[PDB]
Amino acid sequence: GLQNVFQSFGEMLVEPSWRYATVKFGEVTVEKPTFFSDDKELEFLPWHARLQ
Amino acid sequence: TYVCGDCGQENTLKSGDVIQCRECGYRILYKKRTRRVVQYEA
Numbered sequence: 452g453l454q455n456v457f458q459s460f461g462e463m464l465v466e467p468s469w470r471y472a473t474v475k476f477g478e479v480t481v482e483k484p485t486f487f488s489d490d491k492e493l494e495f496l497p498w499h500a501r502l503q
Numbered sequence: 504t505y506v507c508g509d510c511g512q513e514n515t516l517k518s519g520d521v522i523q524c525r526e527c528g529y530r531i532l533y534k535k536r537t538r539r540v541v542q543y544e545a
């Protein structure tokens with residue numbers, strides 16, 4: 452789903468008025484959920500999110 | 504006295520900022536039940 456969404460948008464030229472800047476999007480990767488604790492990374496569970 | 508979650512340890516912390524389990528990392532604590540006599544009507 453996300454790959455087709457990010458592969459369908461087309462970025463146009465950026466020119467406020469030679470130099471020009473264009474951006475592009477490549478492969479989209481989604482990592483598993485994690486908890487950013489103060490000490491280190493911990494396993495994240497649905498009930499942890501429900502209680503917190 | 505407070506019991507941690509997946510970790511078995513009594514925190515026994517009463518400070519306002521102390522909400523995180525020691526040497527565990529998780530911030531979920533359960534209040535422990537003490538030895539108190541309670542009466543019920545059957």
Ligand SMILES: [Zn+2]
Nearest residue numbers: 507510524527
């Ligand atoms: Zn613990």
